[PDB]
Amino acid sequence: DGTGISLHRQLRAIQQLARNVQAVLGAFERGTADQMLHVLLEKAPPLAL
Amino acid sequence: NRETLDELESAPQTTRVRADLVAIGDRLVFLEALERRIYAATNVPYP
Numbered sequence: 001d002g003t004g005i006s007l008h009r010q011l012r013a014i015q016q017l018a019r020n021v022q023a024v025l026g027a028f029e030r031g032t033a034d035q036m037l038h039v040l041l042e043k044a045p046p047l048a049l
Numbered sequence: 050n051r052e053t054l055d056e057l058e059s060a061p062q063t064t065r066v067r068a069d070l071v072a073i074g075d076r077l078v079f080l081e082a083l084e085r086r087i088y089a090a091t092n093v094p095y096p
Binding site (some may be wrong): 015018022 | 050082
């Protein structure tokens, strides 16, 4: 609309978008550590056995 | 946008007080008994 609303609402979505990119890049950055436990517990039989 | 510049204002005036400080874990904590300090002869029940 040219008003301060329609510009600031666009700023609202971009800084909203700025959080989601930092979120899912952190997802695979930690998700690698998750999978390493699942490949070490696919192997590793118990100690008494 | 990782806004953390909310405030950085004063770091105000400081003094030196006899208090009771111990070390539990990595957290350094006060100790205080409130009988003789604030509830001396006051006839109000201590909570």
